[PDB]
Amino acid sequence: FERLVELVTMMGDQGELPIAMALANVVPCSQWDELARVLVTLFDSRHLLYQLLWNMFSKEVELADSMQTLFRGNSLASKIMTFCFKVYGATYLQKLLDPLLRIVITSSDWQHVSFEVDPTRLEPSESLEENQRNLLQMTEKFFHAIISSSSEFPPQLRSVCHCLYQVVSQRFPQNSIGAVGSAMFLRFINPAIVSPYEAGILDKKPPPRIERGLKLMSKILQSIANHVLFTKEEHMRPFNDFVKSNFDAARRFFLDIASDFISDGNVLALHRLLWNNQEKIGQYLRPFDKMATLLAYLGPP
Amino acid sequence: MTEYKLVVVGAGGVGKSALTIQLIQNHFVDEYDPTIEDSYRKQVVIDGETCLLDILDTAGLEEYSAMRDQYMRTGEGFLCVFAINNTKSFEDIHHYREQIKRVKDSEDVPMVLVGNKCDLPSRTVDTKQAQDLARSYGIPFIETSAKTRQGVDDAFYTLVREIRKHKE
Amino acid sequence: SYARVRAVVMTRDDSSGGWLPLSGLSSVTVFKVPHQEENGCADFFIRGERLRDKMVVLECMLKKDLIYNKVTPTFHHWKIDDKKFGLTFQSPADARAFDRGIRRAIEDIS
Ligand SMILES: Nc1nc2c(ncn2[C@@H]2O[C@H](COP(=O)(O)OP(=O)(O)NP(=O)(O)O)[C@@H](O)[C@H]2O)c(=O)[nH]1
Ligand SMILES: [Mg+2]
Ligand SMILES: [Zn+2]
């Protein structure tokens, strides 16, 4: 059939992916959310995902100025990574955080469990000291549960982190594992922790006292993953001792993840992405005639 | 002292935290540490009134967009920040505006358009573009550079003034 | 570095049975690379590059739970994950100076 149009997976000699990379710099930024979905879905459907991740992650690490800026923005390469975490690890993240969130909402949120640790916002009836005790108690069991999920990590996600670990290592050999665990917590775990209902983990939004706690806990969990201390908010420094003692426990989990099975796409009319950007994929530079002849037959809807 | 709840929104990497830190701590943060949600407080005198500035530093990462409903619901004025070297962030302000109006259920919500990183030689959004967009919104426009601390106070001192006019 | 000896690196072929050189004598070291600040937490490694061609034939990451089997003088081996690695030394004094660096590198892991 016309399925040769889906042969965007063509790989050039001594390199790879000419059509996708050209389409990467041409497609407008507003569609990069949709673009990261169509490439991952197609390539994984043809058992070529690793070559897709190898090309996109390489372009991001060659273009970055410092290692501290890698995959911390909303670039196309960063959206492709977040989409892979979402589609291969949502089941993993759901069943890992659901029992913990059910323990905080039900059986904990009654005796005025409060995680308010900003003294400027502390209610007079509450105590800062016991509130800090609740934040670390909740943060510890959440952190321990993530480090202890090494065996239950999906293999597809384990390959994405290994690919990300190898791509960064070819320009930042020292502590290249840091960018893996940082982006993993920043763009996959913590967004679901802050907004469990929006992530589909919970049925309804947690009570307000718990939403404030999950927000502060994700800030503590992000500092642990970043291997950095709190230095901006003064009311977060009391947690630096807890954060510093959990630095290397996160790396052992990250090193485990970065070392060492889906359906097809649904009714993907890829022409729309292909034809509504058909002017400047040819200017940008050989094979465009082969697809230009393809859609000379197949008319754009 | 009357409290003014300021909220800083904008795309990721435009300088929301470097502008906020230059206001609070008066030093330029050279690192790139993406924020989930930060909070600060500062006492200042504007037009002769001593007041407290409650400041929220929000997340520019679109993964944390589910939090926007809460701080748009509690904030009084919003500092709309875009980098003058990123067209995408310049157009991203529209989607922050429309959600603020939708949550406030009002078309007159006090806010200020801020074009950060003016110290850079490679401008992508020139002054006339942002000035025309600001007139379209009906809000002021301030050019800032959190590196050299240009217009940092002016940007925050303009937003409260918009809040004052809205309260009268 | 915590140690720097000249020894040949051995691997264990389960079919072959026993340890064989992994083939060239190499210079083997144990060292730390710090997380962030130099005088702070770090990762510890064993690295051996052949003098034949200055290229790595073994790189291992040390653990707190690492088992270091000192079977004979001038022969030690260990197990990391699925593979088994070991070295034979040119002198027992070299086998001791290298064992001193592995013992102290584990004590600093934290
Ligand atoms: N040259 C220059 N760099 C700036 C300026 N403002 C911010 N930056 C740089 O922009 C990067 C990100 O700044 P940051 O304040 O973290 O941005 P953000 O808007 O908070 N991002 P996020 O939404 O994720 O929190 C850092 O490298 C910082 O040094 C500026 O005025 N000039
Ligand atoms: Mg920030
Ligand atoms: Zn460390």
Numbering used by the authors:
A (entry chain B): 1205 to 1464, 1477 to 1501, 1513 to 1528
B (entry chain C): 1 to 168
C (entry chain A): 13 to 34, 37 to 124
Could you pull the original sentences from the published paper?
Since the Q61L mutant of KRAS binds to NF1(GRD) with 5-fold higher affinity than wild-type KRAS, we carried out crystallization of the ternary complex using wild-type as well as the Q61L mutant of KRAS and solved the crystal structures at resolutions of 2.75 Å and 2.55 Å, respectively. The structure of the ternary complex obtained with the KRAS-Q61L mutant aligns precisely with the ternary complex structure solved with wild-type KRAS. The partly hydrophobic nature of the interface provides an explanation for the higher affinity of the KRAS-Q61L oncogenic mutant with NF1(GRD), even though this mutant is unable to hydrolyze GTP efficiently. In the ternary complex formed by KRAS-Q61L, the side chain of L61 forms hydrophobic interactions with L1390 from NF1. Unlike KRAS-Q61L, a KRAS-Q61R mutation would disrupt this hydrophobic interaction and cause charge repulsion with arginine finger NF1-R1276. This explains why the KRAS-Q61R mutant binds to NF1 with a much lower affinity than KRAS-Q61L. As seen in the structure, NF1(GRD) acts as a scaffold and uses different interfaces to interact with KRAS and SPRED1. The N-terminal residues L1211–E1220 of the NF1-GAPex domain undergo a structural change to form a long, finger-like loop that inserts itself into the pocket present on SPRED1.
Sprouty-related, EVH1 domain-containing (SPRED) proteins negatively regulate RAS/mitogen-activated protein kinase (MAPK) signaling following growth factor stimulation. The NF1 tumor suppressor gene encodes the cytoplasmic protein neurofibromin that acts as a RAS-specific GTPase-activating protein (GAP) and promotes the conversion of the active guanosine triphosphate (RAS-GTP) form to the inactive guanosine diphosphate (RAS-GDP) form, thereby downregulating its biological activity. The EVH1 domain of SPRED1 interacts with NF1. In this study, we describe the structure of a ternary complex formed by the NF1(GRD) with the SPRED1 (EVH1 domain) and the active KRAS (GMPPNP bound).
